[PDB]
Amino acid sequence: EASLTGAGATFPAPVYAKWADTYQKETGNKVNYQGIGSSGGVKQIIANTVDFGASDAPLSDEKLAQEGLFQFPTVIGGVVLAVNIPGLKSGELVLDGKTLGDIYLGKIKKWDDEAIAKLNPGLKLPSQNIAVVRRADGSGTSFVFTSYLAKVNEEWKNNVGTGSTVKWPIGLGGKGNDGIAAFVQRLPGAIGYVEYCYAKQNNLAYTKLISADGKPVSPTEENFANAAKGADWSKTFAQDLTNQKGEDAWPITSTTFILIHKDQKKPEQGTEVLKFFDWAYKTGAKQANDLDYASLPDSVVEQVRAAWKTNIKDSSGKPLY
Numbered sequence: 001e002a003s004l005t006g007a008g009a010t011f012p013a014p015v016y017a018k019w020a021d022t023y024q025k026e027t028g029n030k031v032n033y034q035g036i037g038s039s040g041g042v043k044q045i046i047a048n049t050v051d052f053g054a055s056d057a058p059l060s061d062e063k064l065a066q067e068g069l070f071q072f073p074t075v076i077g078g079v080v081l082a083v084n085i086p087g088l089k090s091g092e093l094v095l096d097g098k099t100l101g102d103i104y105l106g107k108i109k110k111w112d113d114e115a116i117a118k119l120n121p122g123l124k125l126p127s128q129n130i131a132v133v134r135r136a137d138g139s140g141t142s143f144v145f146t147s148y149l150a151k152v153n154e155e156w157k158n159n160v161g162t163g164s165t166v167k168w169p170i171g172l173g174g175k176g177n178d179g180i181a182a183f184v185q186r187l188p189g190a191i192g193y194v195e196y197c198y199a200k201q202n203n204l205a206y207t208k209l210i211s212a213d214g215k216p217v218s219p220t221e222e223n224f225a226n227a228a229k230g231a232d233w234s235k236t237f238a239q240d241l242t243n244q245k246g247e248d249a250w251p252i253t254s255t256t257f258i259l260i261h262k263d264q265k266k267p268e269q270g271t272e273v274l275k276f277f278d279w280a281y282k283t284g285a286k287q288a289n290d291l292d293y294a295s296l297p298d299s300v301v302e303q304v305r306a307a308w309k310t311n312i313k314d315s316s317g318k319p320l321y
């Protein structure tokens with residue numbers, strides 16, 4: 001029995017809570033995860049106050065070498081646009097990336113705007129103001145969401161850009177993925193970006209999006225998996241999965257990372273962190289799929305195991321796996 005502590009991204013917090021609960025029941029090891037968003041996770045592992053950090057924004061090779069850190073992917077998820085449009089069902093509104101951007105820029109103000117109605121011909125769109133919601137805390141989901149908007153709206157790209165934290169033109173700030181969820185639910189007219197789990201479990205209506213290739217997709221585990229189908233995992237783990245080509249490829253997809261130290265000053269702790277995530281890879285794929293997360297392919301998991309053996313050591317040079 002060991003007590004491990006992790007902190008970071010809220011994006012995969014439901015799968016990690018679920019994995020942790022099952023592992024305790026099967027083995028008695030305790031995992032404590034604090035959802036505080038990816039920036040916090042990164043600071044906390046750097047400070048050495050947790051056993052493991054989590055972030056959906058990959059550090060660069062230089063950055064990992066400078067801090068003594070190793071990073072590895074766990075699951076693939078999808079970010080959706082949760083909406084509160086009185087009278088609209090889940091999956092009936094269709095947005096494109098340029099339209100989505102123009103909402104977040106503050107350019108489109110009403111739900112029956114010409115640009116929105118042209119995308120959804122059948123619908124009877126209300127004349128309700130749009131209330132944009134966005135994150136207040138340094139976030140991995142913000143990263144992924146502003147990475148996607150920088151590729152499909154050139155005014156966003158030039159005026160706001162990409163980051164964990166940016167200068168939001170308009171909108172109300174919610175803390176965590178659970179805070180955007182709560183916000184949408186209370187505000188008639190609201191739109192907020194959440195990892196798909198948080199809209200499904202809260203029963204929030206969500207849109208469809210038009211893929212890179214120009215077809216409207218739904219967000220579904222399969223569709224998240226489809227967006228990752230042509231990723232070259234053998235070159236890097238830091239893959240960008242936003243606006244991918246292919247059939248039924250969800251446009252705002254992403255993987256997520258775990259960060260640990262390479263020179264493990266507490267080898268027992270470090271050894272138990274690896275066993276947990278090995279356990280999850282080996283047996284956790286149903287729980288992940290049950291929260292609509294796609295799993296990594298077997299070849300990637302084999303990559304991580306090979307890199308565990310080469311990189312993770314104690315202060316005597318000895319490997320931990």
Ligand SMILES: O=P([O-])(O)O
Nearest residue numbers: 010011038140141
């Ligand atoms: O996963 P987040 O909390 O860093 O968005």
